[PDB]
Amino acid sequence: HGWVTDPPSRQALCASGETSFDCGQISYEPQSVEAPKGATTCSGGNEAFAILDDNSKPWPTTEIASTVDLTWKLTAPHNTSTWEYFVDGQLHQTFDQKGQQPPTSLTHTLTDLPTGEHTILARWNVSNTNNAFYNCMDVVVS
Ligand SMILES: [Cu+2]
Structure with missing residues (x-):
């Protein structure tokens, strides 16, 4: 379990009360977006956290540079194979x-x-x- 805190992910912004809408259960356990390997959606397909896939919501954005330091907070550091980063769905x-x-x-x-x-x-x-943890960050790069 764990989530990306900086730049804040969608579940981080929910858990910190920075969204102007109610996010539901995810606001109380941002560390728990767990779903089988192989997905490329913000929720990973975990049905309890489907709001994270809704792009019609006014999600806040973060201004960053092209080179940025990205920070995780882990509550239970499981043995790990890889950390993968996609930009707009494509592996980076x-x-x-x-x-x-x-x-x-x-x-x-x-x-x-x-x-x-x-x-x-x-x-x-x-x-x-067979599970992975899924975190999305909305950003504006300049
Ligand atoms: Cu765990």
Whole structure:
């Protein structure tokens, strides 16, 4: 369990009360967006958190540069295979954890992000289960 805190993901903004709409249950457990490997949606297909896929909502955006430091907060650091990052649904960067347990505070540096409005998807793959954790960040790159 864990979620991306900076730049804040959709479940982070819900849990911190930064959205102008009620997000439901996810507001109380942002660390729990868990779903089988292989998806590219913000919820991963977890039906209890379907609001995270609704793009009609006025989701807030974050202004960032093309090179940005991205921070996770883990509550239960499971042995990890890879951390995958997509930009608008297309794989951008991969980090290999070699099946090791990560630190509960973890920072990665993304580079070469395209300018304009985009949505990053962070996919955390657990090495000893069939599940991953899904985090979306809406951003404006300049
Ligand atoms: Cu867990």
